[PDB]
Design an enzyme around this catalytic site. Structure first.
Site, PDB file in Angstrom:
ATOM      1  N   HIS E 201       0.811  -1.206   0.000  1.00 46.91           N
ATOM      2  CA  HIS E 201       0.000   0.000   0.000  1.00 46.91           C
ATOM      3  C   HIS E 201       0.842   1.252   0.000  1.00 46.91           C
ATOM      4  O   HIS E 201       0.291   2.347   0.122  1.00 46.91           O
ATOM      5  CB  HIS E 201      -0.979   0.005   1.157  1.00 46.91           C
ATOM      6  CG  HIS E 201      -2.103  -0.961   0.967  1.00 46.91           C
ATOM      7  ND1 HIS E 201      -2.928  -1.365   1.994  1.00 46.91           N
ATOM      8  CD2 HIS E 201      -2.560  -1.577  -0.147  1.00 46.91           C
ATOM      9  CE1 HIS E 201      -3.839  -2.197   1.521  1.00 46.91           C
ATOM     10  NE2 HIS E 201      -3.637  -2.343   0.225  1.00 46.91           N
ATOM     11  N   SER E 205      -1.429  -1.686  -6.233  1.00 46.21           N
ATOM     12  CA  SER E 205      -1.276  -3.011  -6.810  1.00 46.21           C
ATOM     13  C   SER E 205      -0.547  -2.976  -8.147  1.00 46.21           C
ATOM     14  O   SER E 205      -0.390  -1.929  -8.777  1.00 46.21           O
ATOM     15  CB  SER E 205      -2.636  -3.677  -7.005  1.00 46.21           C
ATOM     16  OG  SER E 205      -3.271  -3.922  -5.765  1.00 46.21           O
ATOM     17  N   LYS E 227     -15.735 -10.927  -5.761  1.00 44.37           N
ATOM     18  CA  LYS E 227     -14.975 -12.023  -6.341  1.00 44.37           C
ATOM     19  C   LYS E 227     -14.256 -12.795  -5.256  1.00 44.37           C
ATOM     20  O   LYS E 227     -14.145 -14.024  -5.323  1.00 44.37           O
ATOM     21  CB  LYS E 227     -13.990 -11.504  -7.386  1.00 44.37           C
ATOM     22  CG  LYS E 227     -13.260 -12.608  -8.145  1.00 44.37           C
ATOM     23  CD  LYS E 227     -12.411 -12.050  -9.283  1.00 44.37           C
ATOM     24  CE  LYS E 227     -11.720 -13.157 -10.079  1.00 44.37           C
ATOM     25  NZ  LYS E 227     -10.873 -12.604 -11.182  1.00 44.37           N
ATOM     26  N   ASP E 228     -13.815 -12.094  -4.219  1.00 43.86           N
ATOM     27  CA  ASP E 228     -13.347 -12.783  -3.031  1.00 43.86           C
ATOM     28  C   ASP E 228     -14.407 -13.733  -2.517  1.00 43.86           C
ATOM     29  O   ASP E 228     -14.151 -14.927  -2.350  1.00 43.86           O
ATOM     30  CB  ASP E 228     -12.991 -11.776  -1.952  1.00 43.86           C
ATOM     31  CG  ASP E 228     -11.889 -10.868  -2.372  1.00 43.86           C
ATOM     32  OD1 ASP E 228     -11.200 -11.210  -3.354  1.00 43.86           O
ATOM     33  OD2 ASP E 228     -11.743  -9.802  -1.745  1.00 43.86           O
ATOM     34  N   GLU E 271       6.915 -35.644   4.171  1.00 44.10           N
ATOM     35  CA  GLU E 271       5.625 -35.626   3.517  1.00 44.10           C
ATOM     36  C   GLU E 271       5.740 -34.947   2.161  1.00 44.10           C
ATOM     37  O   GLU E 271       6.791 -34.422   1.784  1.00 44.10           O
ATOM     38  CB  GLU E 271       4.598 -34.957   4.412  1.00 44.10           C
ATOM     39  CG  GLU E 271       5.008 -33.604   4.866  1.00 44.10           C
ATOM     40  CD  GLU E 271       4.046 -33.078   5.880  1.00 44.10           C
ATOM     41  OE1 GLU E 271       2.891 -33.548   5.899  1.00 44.10           O
ATOM     42  OE2 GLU E 271       4.453 -32.215   6.680  1.00 44.10           O
TER      43      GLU E 271
HETATM   44  C1  HEM Z   1      -1.081 -22.800   8.749  1.00 42.57           C
HETATM   45  C2  HEM Z   1      -1.268 -23.119  10.025  1.00 42.57           C
HETATM   46  C3  HEM Z   1      -0.685 -24.394  10.646  1.00 42.57           C
HETATM   47  C4  HEM Z   1      -0.077 -25.454  10.134  1.00 42.57           C
HETATM   48  C5  HEM Z   1       0.232 -25.786   8.669  1.00 42.57           C
HETATM   49  C6  HEM Z   1       0.259 -26.318  11.229  1.00 42.57           C
HETATM   50  C7  HEM Z   1       0.884 -27.506  11.138  1.00 42.57           C
HETATM   51  C8  HEM Z   1       0.407 -28.582  11.780  1.00 42.57           C
HETATM   52  C9  HEM Z   1       0.827 -29.911  11.501  1.00 42.57           C
HETATM   53  C10 HEM Z   1       1.867 -30.299  10.448  1.00 42.57           C
HETATM   54  C11 HEM Z   1       0.161 -30.699  12.298  1.00 42.57           C
HETATM   55  C12 HEM Z   1       0.232 -32.215  12.394  1.00 42.57           C
HETATM   56  C13 HEM Z   1      -0.411 -32.746  11.129  1.00 42.57           C
HETATM   57  C14 HEM Z   1      -1.429 -33.749  11.559  1.00 42.57           C
HETATM   58  O1  HEM Z   1      -1.639 -33.868  12.792  1.00 42.57           O
HETATM   59  O2  HEM Z   1      -2.019 -34.416  10.676  1.00 42.57           O
HETATM   60  C15 HEM Z   1      -0.694 -29.884  13.077  1.00 42.57           C
HETATM   61  C16 HEM Z   1      -1.512 -30.357  14.015  1.00 42.57           C
HETATM   62  C17 HEM Z   1      -1.631 -29.542  15.069  1.00 42.57           C
HETATM   63  N1  HEM Z   1      -1.321 -28.215  14.989  1.00 42.57           N
HETATM   64 FE1  HEM Z   1      -0.661 -26.974  13.742  1.00 42.57          FE
HETATM   65  N2  HEM Z   1      -0.150 -25.770  12.400  1.00 42.57           N
HETATM   66  C18 HEM Z   1      -0.716 -24.586  12.045  1.00 42.57           C
HETATM   67  C19 HEM Z   1      -1.241 -23.717  12.904  1.00 42.57           C
HETATM   68  C20 HEM Z   1      -1.508 -24.240  14.100  1.00 42.57           C
HETATM   69  C21 HEM Z   1      -2.376 -23.631  15.038  1.00 42.57           C
HETATM   70  C22 HEM Z   1      -3.048 -22.284  14.758  1.00 42.57           C
HETATM   71  C23 HEM Z   1      -2.409 -24.426  16.090  1.00 42.57           C
HETATM   72  C24 HEM Z   1      -3.156 -24.314  17.422  1.00 42.57           C
HETATM   73  C25 HEM Z   1      -4.029 -23.342  17.653  1.00 42.57           C
HETATM   74  C26 HEM Z   1      -1.572 -25.527  15.789  1.00 42.57           C
HETATM   75  C27 HEM Z   1      -1.391 -26.512  16.644  1.00 42.57           C
HETATM   76  C28 HEM Z   1      -1.563 -27.756  16.237  1.00 42.57           C
HETATM   77  C29 HEM Z   1      -2.003 -28.781  17.102  1.00 42.57           C
HETATM   78  C30 HEM Z   1      -2.362 -28.608  18.585  1.00 42.57           C
HETATM   79  C31 HEM Z   1      -2.060 -29.878  16.401  1.00 42.57           C
HETATM   80  C32 HEM Z   1      -2.488 -31.227  16.992  1.00 42.57           C
HETATM   81  C33 HEM Z   1      -3.528 -31.901  16.121  1.00 42.57           C
HETATM   82  C34 HEM Z   1      -2.821 -33.062  15.494  1.00 42.57           C
HETATM   83  O3  HEM Z   1      -1.564 -33.036  15.494  1.00 42.57           O
HETATM   84  O4  HEM Z   1      -3.508 -33.997  15.014  1.00 42.57           O
HETATM   85  N3  HEM Z   1      -1.019 -25.422  14.567  1.00 42.57           N
HETATM   86  N4  HEM Z   1      -0.534 -28.569  12.762  1.00 42.57           N
END
Ligand code: HEM
Ligand code: HEC
Ligand code: HEM
Ligand code: HEM
Ligand code: HEM
Ligand code: FES
Lengths: 62, 241, 67, 81, 379, 106, 109
Positions: E201, E205, E227-228, E271
Site C-alpha cells: 500500500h 497493486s 470475487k473474493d 511428507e
Molecule cells: C497454517 C497453520 C498451521 C499449520 C500448517 C500447522 C501444522 C500442523 C501440523 C503439520 C500438524 C500435524 C499434522 C497432523 O496432525 O495431521 C498440526 C496439528 C496440530 N497443529 Fe498446527 N499448524 C498450524 C497452525 C496451528 C495452530 C493455529 C495451532 C493451534 C491453535 C496448531 C497446533 C496444532 C495442534 C495442537 C495440532 C495437533 C492436532 C494433530 O496433530 O492432530 N497449529 N498442525
C-alpha cells in the site's frame, strides 16, 4: 393483469429492509427441518439392511 | 527384494462412495476376534460402546461385555475389577507385555490391529489376500519353521499359522462357516474399526453436496451482476483536437 | 464340506491362457531348477506373476459370488 | 495525497454505462463466450504443453527402464550360472 | 468526510486503507490468492486450538491422547483432519501466490519481495514441527534425520545437535520443546503478515500487463470483495470434500504406528511437499555439499530480482522466456516423482540429471534470453 | 557481415513482432516499456498531442483484458507500422547522467 | 525530511509516532507507569515460555513435572519464581497506572 408475486413481494418485503431480512430469517427454520428430514431418506433409501436401523429389527425388542 | 504384489480390488458393501457397512457380517466377524485374534494380536482402543451400531442391544453386549473381563480386585482395596461393569472397558490383552508377547510367539511380535488397516498400504484386500494366499514352497526355497510362505507377506514368510479354514467356527447366525466367508466376513470389521464415524460421517457428504450446488451458481450470479457494469463499458476519444 | 465359492472360482480363472502359460514357465523354471537347484536358482519370481494376473480374473468373480 | 484525487492527469476520455438492472447476467453467455475458449486455449497451448509430454514419456520410459533392471534376474544372466 | 463514520473513532480512519484502496481493472483470479492466503491461516487457528485442548505432549502418553481425540471427544475426528487437511491446501495456496509473482514478474517491488521471502521460510519450518506432533514413526525418524543432517558443520556442529536435542536422543525435550514452538510460532507470522501488506500500500497493486494502470482504478469495497466471496468459499469445497470422502488420500503418511526408537520403517520420505528439496539432498555424494545445495536451493528466490534484464515487465509479452518459465515448472514437478522414489540407480542418474539442469534453467537461461529480444526487437 | 541474410532476418522480427499480442492488441514498442525514472523525465518532455494519444490507447487497451476479447484481427497493429517517438527523447536524458557521472568521477 | 532515515522505509515513518511525540514539562514519576507497565509484560513472556517447555499439563502427572523443573533443569528454580514474582509486582504496577488516573482525573479522555 395482476402483479406477479415479485412485484407484490418486493413491495411486500424486499423494499423494507427488516421485512426483507425477516422472511430470510424465517425461511431457514422450516427449511432445515424439512431439509434435514427429506434428504436423510436419499442417504437412507440407498442404505438398506446394512444398518441396525434396518438390521436390528432382526433382534430388537428381543 | 521380493516383487511386491498388489491385491486385486474387490467390490465391497462399503466400497462405493455412499456404500455403507452392513453390521450383519460385522457382528459375525466380531466373534472371529472373540474366537481367533484374541490369541495374540490385540485391539486396545474401543470401549464396549459399540452397542447398537454393531446392532448390539444395550443389554445384549453389556451381558456380552460382562463375561469378557473378570480379574482380581482384592489387593488391599486397591483393585481394577472383576466383571467389567460398564462399557468403558477395553479388552484383556492376551499378553501383559511385549516380552511376554514376543517370547510366547517366539521372536514374532503380533501387532495391535486397531488402526492397522490405515497402517498397511492397500486397504483391506491386502489382508483378505494375505488371508487367502498360502502357497507351496517353490523348488529352491526353504523357510524358518514358524515362517509360512505367502507372497503376501513382504519377506513372504510368516510365523502365523493359517487360522482360517472352512468352518473354523459357527457364526452367530448359524450361517455355514467358510474359509473365504469366515475370511471375507471379517474384512468389513476392521474397516469399520479405524473409523466408527464412517457410516455416520458420510451423511455430511451428501448433506454438503446439495448444499453446495446451491450457492456457487448463486454467487456466480451475484458476482457477474456486479461485473455486469464493468464488462459493459464503452470508451470514446473525442479530443477537442 | 461347503466347498467354498473361493477355490471353486480359482480353477475357472487358472483355466485361462496366461495362467497355464506362465504356469508352464513355472515348470520351465522349476524344470531347469530341478537338477540345477544346486545353483541359486529359484522360481518364486515367476509364480508371483502367475498369481498376479490369476486373481485379477478371480477379482471380477467370486466376491460377487460370496456372501 | 487522497488516494484518488492526485493520482494522475487525464484529458478527454468519456465513459458510458447502465444500471445493472438495465441488462441481464447472461447476455448470450453460452453463444458468445463459447468461441472465446479457443483463442485463449489455442494461444498458450502452443507455448506450454509440449514440455510435459516429454516428462510423461520419461515417467513410463524410466519406469520401464527401471523395471527390467531389477524385476527379472534370469535376464542378463539367466538362472544358468 | 463530514459526519463520516470513518473518522469518528480515529481507528476507522485506518480502516480507510481498504474501502478506498484503489484497484486495477483487469485482474486474473490469480490475484485472489493474496487475500486467499490469510483465509486458511484463520480457519486453522481455531482448529489446532480446540484440538490443543484435549491433546497433551508427554513422551510416553502423548500419542495415546490423540486416539482419544478422534474417538471419544465430541466430533473429535472431523477436527483433527481439518487442521491437517488445511495444511497442504494452504501450501498449494502458497506457491500459487508465488506463482503469480514471476508470471507477471511483479517482484519489481523490491524489499516487499524479501519480506514475502522470509514470511514463507518460517511457515514451512512451522508445520515441520507440527508434523512431529502425531508422534508417528515417520514423524520420529523424519525428526531424527534432519537434525542428524545438521551436524556436518566442520567445527561447532556437534553440540548444537544435542543442544537442540537437549540430550542424546529424540526424547521429551526434543518433543515438548516444539509443542511450544509449533504452537507459539504462527502468531508472529500473523503479526508479520500485515507488514508484508503495508509496503504494497505504498505503491498500490500491480497489473497483468506490466503497464501502469493509473489511468483507471476501482474502489475496492464493492467489487473484488465479491470475487473474493466467490474465490474464498471455493477452497472450502475440495477442502471439505477431500476431508470426508477420501480423508487419507493425501494422508499418504501411514504411521499411526507408535514410534519404535529401535525399529526403522521400510521407507522414510518426508511428507509430499518437502520431497523435491529432500530429493536434492540425495544428489550430492558430499553430505556437506548437499547441505549448501539444499538450503541455498530455495534462497535463489532472493536472487531473482537481480536478474531482471528486460525493458518490459510482464512475461506475457515475452514469449521466449515463457517457455523457460514452463520449462522450469515441470522441472520442479519432475523432482517430485524422483524424490517420490527410493535410491536405485536409474532414478539416481535421472535425479542426478535434473539437479544441474535445475539451476541452469533459472540462473543462466532466464537472464540470457531477454537481452536478445531487445536486440531482436530493436531496443 | 549480413546483406541478403539481413533481409532474411527481418521476417523473424516481423514474425516475432507478431508473436507478441500487443501488435494484435494495439500497442507499440514504446508504450510497453518497463518503467524507468528517466522515462519520467522523458514523459515530461512529450507534448500532449503526442502525450495524449499514447494515453487513450491504454485505457482502451486494458479494458479488453478483463473481457479477454482481442481486437478484430485486421485492425491489429502491423509490423511496418512503428513509431520510436519515445526513444529519441529518452536518449537525451541518458547521456545527461553519463556526462554528470563522468564529471562526477573526478 | 531530506534523506531522513525515518522515511526511507515507509515503516520508520510510523516510528515518528515516538521520537517527535511532544510531551508535557512537569511530570511526576507517576507518569512512568504507562511505559513501565509494558515492561513486565515482555519480561514475563519469556519466562513462562521457557518454563512452558519442561512443564506439561496432565492431570495425573502434571504437578510432578514442576518438581522436576526447579530441581534438575538448568537454573529451573530461578525461573519459576521469576514468572511468578513478576506477577504481583505487575499488578502493583497496574493499580498505580490507574492510581494516577483519578488523582489527576485524566479520565476526561
Ligand atoms: C497454517 C497453520 C498451521 C499449520 C500448517 C500447522 C501444522 C500442523 C501440523 C503439520 C500438524 C500435524 C499434522 C497432523 O496432525 O495431521 C498440526 C496439528 C496440530 N497443529 Fe498446527 N499448524 C498450524 C497452525 C496451528 C495452530 C493455529 C495451532 C493451534 C491453535 C496448531 C497446533 C496444532 C495442534 C495442537 C495440532 C495437533 C492436532 C494433530 O496433530 O492432530 N497449529 N498442525
Ligand atoms: C498363532 C497365534 C495367532 C493367531 C491365532 C492369529 N494371529 Fe495372526 N499373527 C500372530 C503372530 C505371532 C504373527 C506374526 C508371525 C511372525 O511374525 O512370524 C501374526 C501375523 C499376523 C498378521 C501380520 C503380521 C503383521 O505384522 O501385521 C496379522 C495382520 C495378523 N496376524 C492378524 C491376525 C488375524 C487377522 C488372525 C485371524 C485370521 C490372526 N492374527 C490369528 C499371532 C496370531
Ligand atoms: C501466507 C503467506 C502470504 C500471505 C498471507 C500474503 C498476503 C498477501 C496479500 C494479501 C497480498 C495482496 C494480494 C496479492 O497481491 O496477492 C500479497 C501480495 C504479495 N505478496 Fe504476499 N502473501 C504471502 C506470501 C507471500 C510470499 C511467500 C511472497 C514472496 C515470496 C509474497 C510476496 C508478495 C508479492 C510480490 C505480492 C504482490 C504480488 C502482486 O503484485 O501481484 N507474499 N501477499
Ligand atoms: C497493563 C495495562 C496497561 C498498559 C500496558 C498501559 C499502557 C499505557 C501507556 C504506555 C500509557 C501512556 C503513559 C501513561 O499515560 O501512563 C497509558 C496511559 C493511560 N492508560 Fe493505559 N495502560 C494500561 C492499563 C490501563 C488501564 C487499566 C487503564 C484504565 C482502567 C488505562 C487507562 C489509561 C489512561 C487513562 C491513560 C492516560 C493517563 C494519563 O493521561 O496520565 N491504562 N497506558
Ligand atoms: C503478565 C503476564 C502473566 C501472568 C501474570 C501470568 C500468570 C501466571 C500465573 C498466575 C502463574 C502460576 C503462578 C505460579 O506458578 O507461581 C504462571 C505461571 C505460568 N505462566 Fe503465566 N502468566 C503471564 C504470562 C504468561 C506467559 C507469557 C506465559 C508463557 C509464555 C505464561 C505461562 C505460564 C506458565 C507456562 C507457567 C508455568 C510456571 C508455573 O506455573 O510455575 N504466562 N503465570
Ligand atoms: S544418512 Fe543413513 S544412509 Fe544416508
Amino acid at each position: 393483469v395482476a402483479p406477479t408475486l415479485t412485484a407484490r413481494l418486493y413491495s411486500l418485503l424486499f423494499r423494507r429492509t427488516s421485512t426483507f431480512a425477516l422472511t430470510i430469517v424465517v425461511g431457514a427454520l422450516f427449511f432445515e427441518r424439512a431439509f434435514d428430514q427429506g434428504a436423510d431418506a436419499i442417504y437412507e433409501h440407498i442404505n438398506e439392511g446394512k444398518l441396525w436401523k434396518h438390521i436390528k429389527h432382526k433382534y430388537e425388542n428381543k | 527384494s521380493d516383487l511386491e504384489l498388489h491385491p486385486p480390488s474387490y467390490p465391497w458393501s462399503h466400497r462405493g462412495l455412499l456404500s455403507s457397512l452392513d453390521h450383519t457380517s460385522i457382528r459375525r466377524g466380531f466373534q472371529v476376534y472373540k474366537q481367533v485374534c484374541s490369541s495374540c494380536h490385540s485391539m486396545d482402543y474401543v470401549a464396549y460402546r459399540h452397542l447398537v451400531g454393531v446392532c448390539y442391544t444395550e443389554d445384549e453386549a453389556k451381558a456380552l461385555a460382562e463375561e469378557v473381563e473378570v480379574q482380581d480386585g482384592p489387593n488391599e482395596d486397591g483393585e481394577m475389577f472383576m466383571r467389567p461393569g460398564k462399557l468403558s472397558d477395553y479388552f484383556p490383552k492376551p499378553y501383559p507385555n511385549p516380552e511376554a508377547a514376543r517370547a510366547a510367539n517366539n521372536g514374532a511380535l503380533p501387532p495391535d490391529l486397531s488402526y492397522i488397516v490405515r497402517a498397511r498400504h492397500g486397504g483391506e484386500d491386502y489382508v483378505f489376500s494375505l488371508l487367502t494366499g498360502y502357497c507351496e514352497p517353490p523348488t529352491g526355497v526353504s523357510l524358518r519353521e514358524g515362517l509360512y510362505f505367502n507372497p503376501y507377506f513382504p519377506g513372504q514368510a510368516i510365523g502365523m499359522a493359517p487360522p482360517i479354514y472352512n468352518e473354523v467356527l459357527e457364526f452367530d447366525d448359524g450361517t455355514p462357516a467358510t474359509m473365504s466367508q469366515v475370511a471375507k466376513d471379517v474384512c468389513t470389521f476392521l474397516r469399520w474399526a479405524a473409523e466408527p464415524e464412517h457410516d455416520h460421517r458420510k451423511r455430511m457428504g451428501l448433506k454438503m453436496l446439495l448444499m453446495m450446488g446451491l450457492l456457487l451458481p448463486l454467487v456466480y450470479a451475484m458476482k457477474r451482476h456486479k461485473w455486469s457494469v464493468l464488462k459493459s463499458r464503452k470508451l470514446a476519444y473525442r479530443p477537442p483536437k | 464340506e461347503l466347498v467354498d465359492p473361493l477355490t471353486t472360482v480359482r480353477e475357472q480363472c487358472e483355466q485361462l491362457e496366461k495362467c497355464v502359460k506362465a504356469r508352464e514357465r513355472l515348470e520351465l523354471c522349476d524344470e531347469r531348477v530341478s537338477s540345477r537347484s544346486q545353483t541359486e536358482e529359484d522360481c518364486t519370481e515367476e509364480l508371483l506373476d502367475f498369481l498376479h494376473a490369476r486373481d485379477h480374473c478371480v477379482a471380477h468373480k467370486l466376491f460377487n459370488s460370496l456372501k | 495525497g487522497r488516494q484518488f484525487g492526485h493520482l494522475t492527469r487525464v484529458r478527454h476520455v468519456i465513459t458510458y454505462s447502465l444500471s445493472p438492472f438495465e441488462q441481464r447476467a447472461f447476455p448470450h453467455y453460452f453463444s458468445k463466450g463459447i468461441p472465446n475458449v479457443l483463442r485463449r486455449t489455442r494461444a498458450c497451448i502452443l507455448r506450454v504443453a509440449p514440455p510435459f509430454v516429454a516428462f510423461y514419456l520419461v515417467y513410463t520410459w524410466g519406469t520401464q527402464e527401471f523395471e527390467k533392471s531389477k524385476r527379472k534376474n534370469p535376464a542378463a544372466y539367466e538362472n544358468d550360472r | 468526510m463530514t459526519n463520516i463514520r470513518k473518522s469518528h473513532p480515529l481507528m476507522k480512519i485506518v480502516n480507510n486503507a481498504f474501502i478506498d484502496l484503489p484497484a486495477p481493472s483487469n485482474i486474473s483470479s490469480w490475484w485472489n490468492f493474496g487475500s486467499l492466503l490469510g483465509i486458511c491461516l484463520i480457519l486453522q487457528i481455531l482448529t489446532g486450538l480446540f484440538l490443543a485442548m484435549h491433546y497433551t505432549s508427554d513422551t510416553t502418553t502423548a500419542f495415546s491422547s490423540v486416539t482419544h481425540i478422534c474417538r471419544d471427544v465430541n466430533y473429535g475426528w472431523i477436527i483433527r483432519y481439518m487442521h491437517a487437511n488445511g495444511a497442504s491446501m494452504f501450501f498449494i495456496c502458497l506457491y500459487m501466490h508465488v506463482g503469480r509473482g514471476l508470471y507477471y514478474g511483479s517482484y519489481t517491488f523490491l524489499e516487499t519481495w524479501n519480506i514475502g521471502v522470509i514470511l514463507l521460510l518460517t511457515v514451512m519450518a512451522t508445520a515441520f514441527m507440527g508434523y512431529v506432533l502425531p508422534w508417528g514413526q515417520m514423524s520420529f525418524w523424519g525428526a531424527t534425520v534432519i537434525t542428524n543432517l545438521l551436524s556436518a558443520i566442520p567445527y561447532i556442529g556437534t553440540n548444537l545437535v544435542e543442544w537442540i536435542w537437549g540430550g542424546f536422543s529424540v526424547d521429551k525435550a526434543t518433543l515438548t520443546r516444539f509443542f511450544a514452538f509449533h504452537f507459539i510460532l504462527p502468531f508472529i507470522i500473523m503479526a508479520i503478515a500485515m507488514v508484508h501488506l503495508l509496503f504494497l500500500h505504498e505503491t498500490g497493486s500491480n497489473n497483468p500487463t506490466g503497464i501502469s494502470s493509473d489511468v483507471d482504478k476501482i474502489p475496492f469495497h464493492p467489487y473484488y470483495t465479491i470475487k473474493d466471496i466467490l474465490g474464498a468459499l471455493l477452497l472450502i469445497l475440495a477442502l471439505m470434500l477431500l476431508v470426508l470422502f477420501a480423508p487419507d488420500l493425501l494422508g499418504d503418511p501411514d504411521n499411526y504406528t507408535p514410534a519404535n526408537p529401535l525399529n526403522t520403517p521400510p521407507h522414510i520420505k518426508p511428507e509430499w511437499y518437502f520431497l523435491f528439496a529432500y530429493a536434492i539432498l540425495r544428489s550430492i555424494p558430499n553430505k556437506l555439499g548437499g547441505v549448501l545445495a539444499l538450503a541455498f536451493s530455495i534462497l535463489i528466490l532472493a536472487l531473482i530480482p537481480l536478474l531482471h534484464t528486460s525493458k518490459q515487465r510482464s512475461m506475457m509479452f515475452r514469449p521466449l522466456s515463457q517457455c523457460l518459465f514452463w520449462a522450469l515448472v515441470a522441472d520442479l514437478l519432475t523432482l517430485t516423482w524422483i524424490g517420490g522414489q527410493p535410491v536405485e540407480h536409474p532414478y539416481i542418474t535421472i535425479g542426478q540429471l535434473a539437479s544441474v539442469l535445475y539451476f541452469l534453467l533459472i540462473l543462466v537461461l532466464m537472464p540470457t534470453a531477454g537481452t536478445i529480444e531487445n536486440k531482436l526487437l530493436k531496443w | 557481415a549480413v546483406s541478403a541474410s539481413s533481409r532474411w532476418l527481418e521476417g523473424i522480427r516481423k514474425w516475432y513482432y507478431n508473436a507478441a499480442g500487443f501488435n494484435k492488441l494495439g500497442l507499440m514498442r514504446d508504450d510497453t516499456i518497463h518503467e524507468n525514472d528517466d522515462v519520467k523525465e522523458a514523459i515530461r518532455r512529450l507534448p500532449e498531442n503526442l502525450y495524449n494519444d499514447r494515453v487513450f490507447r491504454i485505457k482502451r487497451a486494458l479494458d479488453l483484458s478483463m473481457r479477454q476479447q482481442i481486437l478484430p484481427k485486421e485492425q491489429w497493429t502491423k509490423y511496418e507500422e512503428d513509431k520510436s517517438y519515445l526513444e529519441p527523447y529518452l536518449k537525451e536524458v541518458i547521456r545527461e547522467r553519463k556526462e554528470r557521472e563522468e564529471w562526477a568521477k573526478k
